[PDB]
Design a protein around this ligand. Sequence first.
Ligand SMILES: *[C@@H]1O[C@H](CO)[C@@H](O[C@@H]2O[C@H](CO)[C@@H](O[C@@H]3O[C@H](CO)[C@@H](O)[C@H](O[C@@H]4O[C@H](CO)[C@@H](O)[C@H](O)[C@@H]4O)[C@@H]3O)[C@H](O)[C@H]2NC(C)=O)[C@H](O)[C@H]1NC(C)=O
Lengths: 49, 388, 145
Amino acid sequence: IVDQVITIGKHVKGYHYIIANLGFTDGDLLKIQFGGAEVSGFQIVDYDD
Amino acid sequence: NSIQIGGLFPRGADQEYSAFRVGMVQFSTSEFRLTPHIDNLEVANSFAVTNAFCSQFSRGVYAIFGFYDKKSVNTITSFCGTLHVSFITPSFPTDGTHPFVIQMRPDLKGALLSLIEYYQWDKFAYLYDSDRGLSTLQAVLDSAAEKKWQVTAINVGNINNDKKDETYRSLFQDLELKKERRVILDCERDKVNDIVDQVITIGKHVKGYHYIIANLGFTDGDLLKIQFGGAEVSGFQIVDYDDSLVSKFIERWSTLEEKEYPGAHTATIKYTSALTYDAVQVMTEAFRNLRKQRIEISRRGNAGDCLANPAVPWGQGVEIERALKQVQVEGLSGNIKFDQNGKRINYTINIMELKTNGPRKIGYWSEVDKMVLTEDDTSGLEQKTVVV
Amino acid sequence: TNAFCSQFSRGVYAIFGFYDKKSVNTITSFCGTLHVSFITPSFPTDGTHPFVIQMRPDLKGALLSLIEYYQWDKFAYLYDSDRGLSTLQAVLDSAAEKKWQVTAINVGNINNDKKDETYRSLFQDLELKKERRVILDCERDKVND
Ligand SMILES: *[C@@H]1O[C@H](CO)[C@@H](O[C@@H]2O[C@H](CO)[C@@H](O[C@@H]3O[C@H](CO)[C@@H](O)[C@H](O[C@@H]4O[C@H](CO)[C@@H](O)[C@H](O)[C@@H]4O)[C@@H]3O)[C@H](O)[C@H]2NC(C)=O)[C@H](O)[C@H]1NC(C)=O
């Protein structure tokens, strides 16, 4: 989905995505990271512990 | 009849050489055979190019086919002019009138300026690469004075590639001060993909932006990425895949073994490679028009050292030039014709636009007719005025 | 190329001369390969070419500084391609950052056996925007013209 989103260009400022899983950093975000659209999610594995 | 010629191929020109080989086969006749002496050197290095030239000259060649860079171009044009040696090249056209040089690449400068006026642009960004000379840069800058344009020229060439990201972010930061939405990419097939990729990342490929790929290979690069983005993309295509001539070439090209012919198992071909193939045809028709004209030019491999002083030009070279320049056949890059200098004339460059279904020719550009649109659309859409 | 190889066969320890925007690459290349030192008053090389001593300091810096001093935002830049577009790229690149409206015009390729209807058509474009601030980047000769 993220790949398709970037292709159609719906990853720019104005869009807001929420990844409904416990692995937010488990996927590749470097792609929709500089797009502009805000992306939120959930992380269960705190790498700060 | 064995005609020895030189071949200067820059390391990495796989498809170009593959196309060079296919040409040798397709245009091989019993009347005479061409003997290519291939030399793979760093085209950029002026010194190396000098040796490769004098080496092929001592071997006693009748003509030389190769490439040059913005740095080594002066070496070639100079030596070939002094030693009366003919040099055929698909590389960018020389900025001037240099004799004994045959250029396969047509001048895009004209087609570009015409396209700008078509879209009626008054303020646009011009990202250029100093690799093919600032010949086109000067073109748009000089025209910016007459046509009154606000051009934002930016050298996207000297960007160091081992950290080239904080540079692109700072690049489109300046292209946002004036809210630039219309960009012209004057780069190679490679530097274009890099920019296109960055454009998609920052999301500047959506509706509202308009890009123009300033090269003769619009379909040579990957467009599937910025195809569904929304931003309109235009460019230029020299290899018309709609010609039965080119269509037949691909039928055999796409099937060739990629093992023996590197990067040759595709349905498309880089314009640089296509010109290489057309170059072989020009050299064949040229040496053929000399046999039928009863002109003796033959010699041996004892032309001597090129640095010979005083340097004496062999008169047989003057005829070889008048032959190549007189050639006029049909190739992948449309009608091939030349003037007294070597610059191509009476050619056609198709103007391309990228739609949802893919690239589509919206017209062509003639050196004598400028831009001419081909009505391949269903116009009159939502224009029917209400009768009150 | 001959003059270089000739002086090289004569066995010299160093070479002093000049180069043009066309022959510059020949010198920088040979002198780098043959480890021969080349001293020249000509324009500085656009890069880092070893075995080359350049007497002429880089003006690119001094020019850009002067522009800011007079606080210029819109000016015409008449250049000559003889000494390379090194300074042209300088003002163009800085025009992006400092936000300038530069009107670059190649006053070099002007054929001299009829160069009058060209100058009249030159200052005709420099009047559309009423340009009153011009930068002449040319040789001592092209400047007097
Ligand atoms: C500038 O560039 C133009 C575009 O390439 C070019 O136009 C071509 O001109 C040639 C010569 O007239 C055209 O060749 C003819 O096409 C027709 C129709 O398909 C053929 O019937 C004809 O066959 C001929 O058959 C004759 C039989 O008697 C024979 O005598 C002839 O030798 C020949 O074989 C030709 O094939 C060609 O189609 C044109 N190209 C285009 C428009 O696609 C111009 O010539 C050129 N201008 C100049 C002055 O050079």
